[PDB]
Amino acid sequence: HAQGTFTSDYSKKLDARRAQDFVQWLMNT
Numbered sequence: 001h002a003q004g005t006f007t008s009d010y011s012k013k014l015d016a017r018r019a020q021d022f023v024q025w026l027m028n029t
């Protein structure tokens with residue numbers, strides 16, 4: 001895999017889009 005959770009920027013586009021709370025994405029769900 002390549003979650004790209006990181007390079008999701010140089011690959012998809014922007015990363016800080018979720019600001020950073022993304023960490024909660026797979027935690028508070």
Ligand SMILES: *C(=O)CC[C@H](NC(=O)CC[C@H](NC(=O)CCCCCCCCCCCCCCC)C(=O)O)C(=O)O
Pocket residue numbers: 002003004005006008009012013014015017026
């Ligand atoms: C902008 O939104 C880009 C287009 C679109 N974006 C999204 O889907 C939003 C996030 C984006 N895509 C992902 O969700 C893909 C991430 C991989 C799936 C998650 C697996 C679990 C992650 C576990 C993290 C463990 C930490 C390891 C250390 C790095 C993105 O990835 O940013 C898009 O096309 O996806």
